[PDB]
Design a binder for this molecule. Structure first.
Ligand SMILES: Nc1ncnc2c1ncn2[C@@H]1O[C@H](COP(=O)(O)OP(=O)(O)O)[C@@H](O)[C@H]1O
Ligand SMILES: Nc1ncnc2c1ncn2[C@@H]1O[C@H](COP(=O)(O)OP(=O)(O)O)[C@@H](O)[C@H]1O
Ligand SMILES: [Mg+2]
Ligand SMILES: [Mg+2]
Lengths: 447, 54, 450, 52, 119
């Protein structure tokens, strides 16, 4: 008797624990009914006693009455269903066995998932029965019946939690987004302030969920520009700035930052030949940076997109979000699964960083090098094609900015000390160019 | 003006079907298989007598 | 209670089969070898229920494929060489198979019965597998089990999708040609036979976006590729009752909608982004929204890394609700994935292109797919984009029914006299002429005008 | 540098919402479904003016 | 290539087999009608056919139907094995073939050699 019973699993998928937690949780809060009612129905419960109890919960809450152990017990007693559910003691046990709140939605999803599998098994048995006994239906009719029943299961779970696809859902999200923008100060900047007025006029700041590619030839001030964006985000936002310096150590990034914010000669900082004025400026800058404590520097080499994502989540949890994520050189990252193809490896890194930007709702700045072929031409400004040769990163980037310095190519250029920031690609704004003052001595860009 | 500036050949569509076409469609339908015969007769039925100039 | 399970086991453990039809197929081929071409289109070796018949049919297949005459002796010698003659019942059983079916011209009907039984047998097998997966999920969530069930059922349906397509004689093609002409003549053909593009000059060349067409819209970055494709979607949504389905693999649904609002309302896109909308801007946006909500004929799917199977599945779901689709737009072909072809990007893109063309024919809907031009074009930068610029990215030209390129002289030459003008180049067209159409590009509104 | 930064028209953004916008938002809310109606009324409530 | 097929179809008793991997059968037939009837292809496409155009197209169709010596296979991504199989099927019905036309060699596929396009 037991060998055949052990092999045969007549018990359909269920979670009595999740069912109890949903019921117990509603008895503890009442306000969570609106969310729970979107995920589960009375028929989603496997247990007969839980269906009767949940039906009671539904009736009381829909009527606007407070749901408590006594009210629910009186409701069930009026219908002579209290004995059918296990009595008052069982209702009290349900409220006792789930002392934890904020997980009721997760339990509701488990109950709904189990109900879905239960319905699927029922449909599979019906199809099997139809296959064994077609009752005059041809193969085409049985296939259509199977497709119809399976499509019905899928349709019930189509658009359960707001269902993003239909116009009604998009209108609600559109209005919510507009409302959020109107509540925040919008003096021309809706995202993270770049610190450059002309750049903010074109970009409206660094938007959340954006993957930003900053590309330049060597010594064009690529690291300098990205760091000024980080400095501005650190000084203007309460949320922290996270820097993944894959090429330079943390000490070097800090020294360059000190040169920038204090407007002290970088060479003087390196050589130690600082005058009284230089020391006072550096000290004041340090005092502010320490007061803010809103910057993290990770100088680990050869980081994988998974490691970058993991560390970013760790920091974001401590502060309820991040202001900006900067990844020093995209090409320096590694993907152990794609070692056989560098182009695909870089493409995956770009996709992963974009996914990271959307996941944490944070602008992700990634530095990239321009292809060597550009130097062979050296006749015009950098273009998107110069980056496509290095991993098709254009497709994933929401914003592409190029750094061009005429003085590097032409020392006798009338634009000495001027760096051109070219917007090569922009999803939420115009393309064009912004001229910035490049101060190499201070490792700084000014408007 | 855009039409006049980039006119790749005069596009004057004149599609009235002739009674002659209906006659030839029925003549082909006599040699066609039953499936093709029905489509040719249907096309010949659609052919309206828009004769003019005299 | 002891006599109940024996009759139930005998009646439930035997799957649907027709030994008589199987014998007739084998016996019929032994009588007339020339029928193999027709029979081989309907049945496979695995379609036979009986193990002996599978071995015999495998022998028949091997002999006939080799061009050798199929007779009782040849088949017996073939099976004897493989020590399978005893497994099928000996020479006597082969002789019995040839004797029990003296009738010819019905072999195709028996082949259909064998195929039908095999289909029901596979369906029962899949139902049991799904039931087993439901009882024992082995770590799979409900969504994974649903996808598994959909995949296995879809596989059964796909095998019986284009079964009898081999013979294609001129009489059949003439009938379908006349039926097609008749349908075009019944519908108003004032220059547009398909889905209206919203551009008169373009419609004059293309006669609209045809059903079953795979359309490739290719452009360099910032040429207005997404803008152009979306105007086609907007026009289809405003002129057709059937819904427009958009697979936005690169941009979120909110961003696509904001650009659409900028386009239909003719409100500055920057103003929408910045929120600096005047009273007039709000009134136009509101009126546009009112119409979009009244129509409700547009779906936006912003899921990333979709497979051709997932795209097909979602398209079928929506098409069933409305009795068809007006247009399917797939934002970037290259962003899709094929887990089976990860080792080769070119082959992966080629398979995606073939799958989208199959989707267009399956649902009788125009499928617009956006593609990027190869980087090599920027090295030349002397002429307009050509088909060769796309061949370097997955040979998508072979599968496309229509190829349109977007070229903006002002992007390459800011001092061009064609400022605000975008050239739409027809690189390939199956049902119309090749050439070029000039459109007014309004970047501020994310719109193309005629 | 000040000339180069503020050359093409004075960029003084003044985005406070108008009573007109609140009125149109409420006019749309009358035709909107309950879910959209609540968001439109919320946006109209956020619209400040208080003239006269 | 189609003019070669048209000539083979009009001069031979054996059938012509066309594997149109790029274009549909309807389009190949419309182009054939334009060719044999000497009627403007654009006119056929637009439907602006005069009485003379209809008479020529109709006469051409009558002959093509009388001959019935042409097969059009518009299946995409055919393998050399599939092409060979279909060709043999038709050849058996008529004791041979007059001509086999394969629209674009590059459009065919070999599942065993997906790793190398040249091979
Ligand atoms: N002591 C210094 N004095 C003046 N300019 C300096 C000094 N140190 C560095 N620079 C300048 O700062 C820039 C550093 O470029 P960087 O961002 O590190 O390179 P990349 O573009 O490869 O990321 C260069 O333009 C360089 O000339
Ligand atoms: N605020 C704006 N003002 C003016 N033009 C804009 C604005 N935002 C975007 N554009 C233009 O809209 C187009 C967007 O191109 P898009 O279709 O997204 O790129 P792709 O060709 O890579 O698909 C570009 O030509 C860009 O210059
Ligand atoms: Mg660096
Ligand atoms: Mg796009």
């Amino acid at each position: 008797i037991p060998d055949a019973q052990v092999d045969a699993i007549k018990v359909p998928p269920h979670s009595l624990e999740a069912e109890q937690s949903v019921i117990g949780g509603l008895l503890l809060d009442n306000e969570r009914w609106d969310t729970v009612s979107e995920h589960v129905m009375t028929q989603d419960f496997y247990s007969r006693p839980h269906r009767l109890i949940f039906d009671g919960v539904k009736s009381i809450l829909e009527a606007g009455k407070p749901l408590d152990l006594i009210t629910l017990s009186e409701y069930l007693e009026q219908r002579e269903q209290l004995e059918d559910v296990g009595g008052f003691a069982y209702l009290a046990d349900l409220a006792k066995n789930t002392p934890s709140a904020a997980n009721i939605n997760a339990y509701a999803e488990i109950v709904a998932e189990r109900a879905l599998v239960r319905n699927l098994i029922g449909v599979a048995n019906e199809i099997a029965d139809a296959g064994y006994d077609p009752q005059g239906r041809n193969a085409e009719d049985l296939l259509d019946l199977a497709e119809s029943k399976v499509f019905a299961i899928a349709e019930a779970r189509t658009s359960e939690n707001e269902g993003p696809k239909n116009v009604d859902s998009i209108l609600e999200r559109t209005l919510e987004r507009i409302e959020l923008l109107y509540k925040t100060p919008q003096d021309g900047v809706t995202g993270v302030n770049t610190g450059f007025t002309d750049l903010n006029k074109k970009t409206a700041g660094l938007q959340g969920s954006d993957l930003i590619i900053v590309a330049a030839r060597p010594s064009m001030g690529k690291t300098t520009f990205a760091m000024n964006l980080c400095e501005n985000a650190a000084m203007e936002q309460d949320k922290p700035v996270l820097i993944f310096s894959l090429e330079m150590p943390a000490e070097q990034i800090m020294m360059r930052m000190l040169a920038s914010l204090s407007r002290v000669d970088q060479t003087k900082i390196r050589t130690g030949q600082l005058d009284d004025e230089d020391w006072a400026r550096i000290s004041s800058t340090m005092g502010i940076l320490m007061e803010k404590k809103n910057m993290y520097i990770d100088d680990s080499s050869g980081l994988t997109p998974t490691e970058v994502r993991s560390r970013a989540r760790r920091i974001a949890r401590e502060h309820g979000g991040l202001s900006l994520i900067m990844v020093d050189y995209l090409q320096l990252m590694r993907v152990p699964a794609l070692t056989d193809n560098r182009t695909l490896e870089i493409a995956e890194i770009s996709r992963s960083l974009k996914a990271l930007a959307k996941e944490l709702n944070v602008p992700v700045v990634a530095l990239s090098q321009l292809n060597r072929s550009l130097e062979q031409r050296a006749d015009k400004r950098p273009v998107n094609s110069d980056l496509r040769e290095s991993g098709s990163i254009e497709q994933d980037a929401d914003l592409i900015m190029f750094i061009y310095r005429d003085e590097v190519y032409h020392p006798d250029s009338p634009l000495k000390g001027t760096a051109e920031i070219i917007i090569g690609k922009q999803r939420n704004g115009p393309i064009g160019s912004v001229r910035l003052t490049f101060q190499g001595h201070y490792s700084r860009f000014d408007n | 003006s855009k039409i006049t500036s980039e006119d790749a050949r005069a596009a004057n569509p004149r599609p009235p079907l002739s009674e002659h076409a209906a006659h030839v469609l029925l003549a082909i339908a006599d040699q066609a298989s039953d499936k093709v015969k029905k489509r040719l007769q249907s096309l010949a039925r659609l052919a309206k007598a828009n004769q003019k100039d005299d």
